[PDB]
Write a protein that binds this ligand. Structure first.
Ligand SMILES: C/C(=C\C(=O)OCCCCCCCCC(=O)O)C[C@@H]1OC[C@H](C[C@@H]2O[C@H]2[C@@H](C)[C@H](C)O)[C@@H](O)[C@H]1O
Ligand SMILES: [Zn+2]
Length: 918
């Protein structure tokens, strides 16, 4: 009957987020009003923070991994902004390379067409990247992320292409860029060399054969046996044509069987059990005595030299290794060590060429045949020399963009050398491997385990092949002097080319003549120079972003080294490594101080998302289903260092966390909305319960901040949520509802409660603003009191506030100790539950309690236990060692529902006064 006489305590801040409607309006506003530039221009910026963006490929729409990545970057950046620092965060895009060029190739072929003109082909590639750079930029902004998205970096900008080339120039001037001729990864489907980061290892079925190479007559006479054939094991019959040698383990015993097969003795038992060779050994020979004997290749009748390899393994195979220098790296060095032929008759498309006829290595019927299609017919040609064929499965290197298996071909390519000493900037002498290992020890990794992942790769990596045979990318734009057959690294030549690139882009490398590309002083000798037309590994491009973005803009986009880079843990094999290596040539240090990694988006069963599996969840679908602030809370509230599973159950839990945060903020705003703002300019007398809350607010704030400092948003959101749920909602807001709703608006106890709620809302806003930025922006939009209190027009004016100073607290005020009264509260609530089960009582306000520890504040007990009366009464309900509960000897007040009225249906003394209010 008196509900209309209570304090309204409502706010326009709504319970329902309606995120699908309101978030795009918030983000459109931040773009229109240039919130990021306003963040950078903030007048009281103190300190600097550079996060250097790793560039996604400008191909396709964003997937959930991009969203994960940019949200985490956004939280880290916003944290530093709200700490008061000046922010540098320029997002960028990877525009070159097969990731763009392959999509153009697949379209041309689907359209049944070709495009041979180099300038036009690069134009199609460039326009494709421009289209999807726009698409990804606006998709990034729909996640609520703030960065220099209107002035991002692009590896396709002419200045950027000049920067990438100038980095290459520094490598070449330091003596680390050299030509090598050796077998390397060859992708026949795109007719290009590859390096490790462009290769994906996948299980693949393969023939597996054991082949007998008979010793030649004179070798049998030297060995003093009638029959002997070395048995090799190989999974690549397509390289048998290129055999020049059979490599044995140094100083090892080889067993000759009765049928005349020669194998490593340590492997004879296994081989006989496989049925490869017979079981009876007749003679044992040391491999040192077999070296320089000669066998015969059964496929083509050619000589094969018996050699000793370095580190021949005896765990698989036969202990005798078919050695093909044109198709294996260790084979190649063995062939050179013995001055043997390098047979390599497989062309760029992976097919046998005329060289099989010229040297008589393989029958003419194989001309033009792809090496992988030829293998079945090769195996049949082996006849009786084939001792056993099996089919096995092994992890095999595949091209990262055509998805086809690679092969190896001896070829001349350009490398960054790992174990080549070079002159350091401080004058000393060190290899790149040594510098990179030193540099890693100075980088902070989050998690720490990332260090040894990257360190192990550096310890084991080979020389870095740089040259690729595609068209879309930055050329290795050096001339070869025909008079010397060596590259021209003259500073005048290199910088002249770099300047042309900066002004017109690398197109001119294909269009201009040699004379036109040479300085005026060299054009009389243009006849002696020839362009290198290979382009750079795209991992060199992105490995150069630190130079093109941080250094070449002299701090305007961040410092080099950056404070933080943040990408998936798959970038130890990619961007972390290439940036580390180039940083170490140019600066002899890593171009980052700290690396934070995250895992991958996976499905509900932790499995990888793929179109073949039909388990891909699109970014659009997820945002539309849940809203970006929920997707952002999902990220921060979960162990993002590992894989994150998408499932209804986990998003339901996050929506429940978001609702609790949002409902709590609504209650706070609603219950200080009527507070006279003059309270903000005067101190108050806070109760012990108020002090307990402010002292608690401080304690958990320190813990949320320490957790967020170490990027452990889970630990920090759990602290924050536990405070919201337990101390705030469960204790304080329950004890306070009566005063808030039923006391006079002039009541100073109520005004002191509102000040605590205002300080609490202020801390919630500060700590959630990096994560739920839209929502905290919406909180300030709906609360004039919060905006005045925090002196904030919008979310970007937020600062960490001193509650002690804003509420005028005395410094040496001793903290509350509520342990004794909270144990009583817990024991009373356990006893009250039992009485409620029995039906004796319905709620705590129906009770009186006499506490047996008389040293406790009686009004605090009434407040925390929500009893209507502290002391003795007449009707005993139950008793414990700690207290005795009674029925409260009053009527329920019709206005406040507390059992404090002396007459039935009559307002209590407090309520009567409030109702008389003049
Ligand atoms: C979290 C990741 C993947 C994921 O989890 O993605 C899974 C997305 C879910 C659905 C899959 C989409 C289609 C599935 C299918 O059909 O196959 C890994 C991270 O990604 C973002 C960033 C990509 C930038 O380019 C990298 C730069 C730095 C370097 C120079 O290249 C980077 O941070 C990366 O490390
Ligand atoms: Zn009352």
């Amino acid at each position: 009957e008196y509900k209309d006489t209570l304090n309204l305590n409502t706010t326009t801040f709504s319970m329902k987020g309606n995120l699908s409607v309101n978030e795009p309006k918030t983000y459109a506003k931040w773009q229109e009003q240039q919130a990021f530039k306003r963040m950078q221009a903030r007048k009281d910026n103190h300190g600097d923070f550079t996060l250097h963006d790793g560039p996604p490929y400008a191909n396709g729409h964003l997937h959930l991994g991009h969203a994960l990545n940019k949200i985490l970057k956004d939280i880290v950046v916003k944290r530093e902004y709200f700490k008061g620092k000046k922010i540098y965060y320029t997002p960028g895009w990877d525009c070159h390379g097969l990731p763009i060029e392959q999509q153009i190739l697949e379209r041309l072929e689907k359209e049944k067409t070709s495009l041979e003109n180099p300038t036009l082909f690069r134009e199609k590639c460039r326009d494709h990247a421009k289209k999807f750079l726009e698409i990804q930029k606006n998709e990034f902004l729909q996640l609520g992320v703030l960065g220099d998205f209107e002035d991002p970096y692009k590896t396709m900008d002419f200045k950027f292409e000049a920067s990438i080339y100038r980095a290459l120039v520094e490598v070449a001037k330091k003596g680390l860029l050299k030509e090598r001729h050796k077998p390397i990864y060859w992708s026949y489907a795109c007719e290009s060399a590859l390096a490790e980061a462009e290769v994906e290892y996948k299980m693949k079925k393969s023939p597996s054969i054991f082949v007998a190479f008979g010793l030649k007559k004179e070798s049998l006479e030297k060995l003093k046996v009638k029959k002997a054939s070395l048995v090799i094991w190989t999974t690549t019959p397509w390289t048998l044509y290129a055999n020049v040698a059979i490599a044995l383990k140094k100083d090892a015993v080889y067993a000759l069987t009765q049928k005349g097969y020669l194998v490593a003795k340590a492997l004879h038992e296994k081989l006989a059990a496989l049925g490869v060779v017979d079981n009876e050994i007749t003679h044992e020979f040391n491999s040192n005595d077999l070296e320089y004997l000669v066998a015969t290749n059964p496929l083509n009748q050619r000589d094969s030299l018996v050699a000793l390899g370095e580190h021949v393994g005896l765990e698989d195979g036969t202990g005798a290794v078919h050695t093909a220098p044109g198709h294996g790296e260790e084979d190649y060095y063995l062939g050179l060590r013995y001055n043997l032929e390098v047979l390599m008759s497989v062309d760029e498309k992976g097919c046998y060429d005329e060289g099989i006829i010229h040297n008589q290595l393989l029958d003419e019927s194989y001309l033009g045949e792809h090496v992988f299609k030829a293998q079945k017919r090769i195996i049949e040609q082996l006849g009786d020399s084939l001792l056993l064929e099996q089919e096995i499965e092994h992890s095999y290197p595949h091209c990262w963009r055509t998805h086809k298996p690679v092969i190896y071909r001896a070829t001349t390519q350009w490398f960054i050398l790992m174990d080549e000493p070079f002159i350091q900037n401080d004058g000393s002498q060190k290899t790149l491997r040594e510098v990179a290992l030193d540099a890693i020890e100075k980088v902070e990794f989050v998690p720490s385990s990332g260090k040894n992942r990257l360190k192990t790769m550096i310890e084991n990596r080979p020389d870095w092949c740089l040259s690729r045979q595609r068209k879309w990318g930055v050329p290795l734009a050096f001339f070869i002097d025909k008079r010397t057959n060596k590259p021209c690294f003259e500073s005048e030549v290199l910088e002249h080319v770099a300047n042309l690139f900066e002004k017109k882009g690398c197109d001119v490398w294909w269009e201009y003549s040699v004379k036109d590309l040479l300085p005026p002083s060299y054009q009389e000798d243009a006849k002696h120079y020839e362009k290198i037309m290979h382009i750079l590994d795209v991992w060199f491009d992105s490995g150069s972003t630190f130079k093109a973005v941080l250094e070449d803009y002299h701090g305007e986009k961040g410092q080099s080294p950056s404070d933080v880079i943040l990408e998936g843990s798959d970038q130890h094999r990619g961007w972390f490594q290439s940036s580390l290596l180039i940083g170490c040539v140019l600066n002899n240090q890593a171009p980052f101080k700290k690396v934070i990694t995250h895992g991958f988006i996976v499905d509900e069963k932790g499995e990888k998302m793929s179109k073949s599996k039909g388990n891909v969840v699109s970014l659009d679908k997820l945002l539309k289903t849940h809203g970006s602030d929920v997707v952002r809370l999902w990220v921060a509230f979960n162990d993002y260092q590992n894989d994150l599973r998408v499932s209804q159950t986990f998003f339901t839990q996050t929506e429940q966390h978001y609702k609790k945060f949002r409902n709590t903020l609504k209650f706070l705003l609603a219950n200080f909305s009527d507070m006279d703002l003059k309270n903000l300019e005067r101190p108050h007398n806070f109760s012990p319960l108020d002090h307990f809350m402010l002292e608690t607010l401080e304690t958990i704030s320190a813990g949320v901040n320490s957790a967020f400092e170490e990027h452990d948003f889970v630990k920090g959101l759990n602290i924050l949520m536990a405070f919201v749920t337990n101390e705030l909602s469960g204790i304080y807001l329950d004890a306070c509802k009566d005063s808030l709703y039923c006391d006079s608006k002039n009541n100073e106890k109520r005004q002191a409660i509102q000040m605590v709620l205002l300080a609490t809302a202020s801390k919630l806003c500060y700590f959630l603003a990096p994560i739920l930025t839209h929502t905290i922006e919406e909180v300030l939009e709906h609360s004039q009191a919060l905006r005045i209190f925090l002196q904030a027009k919008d979310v970007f004016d937020l600062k960490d506030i001193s509650v002690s100073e804003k509420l005028h607290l005395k410094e040496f005020k001793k903290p509350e100790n509520f342990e004794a009264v909270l144990a009583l509260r817990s024991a009373f609530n356990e006893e009250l539950d039992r009485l409620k089960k029995e039906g004796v009582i319905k709620n705590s306000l129906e009770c009186a309690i006499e506490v047996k520890e008389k040293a406790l504040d009686e009004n605090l007990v009434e407040e925390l236990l929500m009893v209507s009366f502290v002391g003795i009464a007449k009707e005993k309900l139950s008793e414990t060692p700690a207290f005795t509960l009674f029925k409260a000897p009053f009527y329920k007040c019709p206005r406040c529902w507390r059992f404090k009225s002396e007459l039935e249906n009559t307002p209590c003394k407090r309520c009567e006064q409030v109702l008389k209010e003049r």
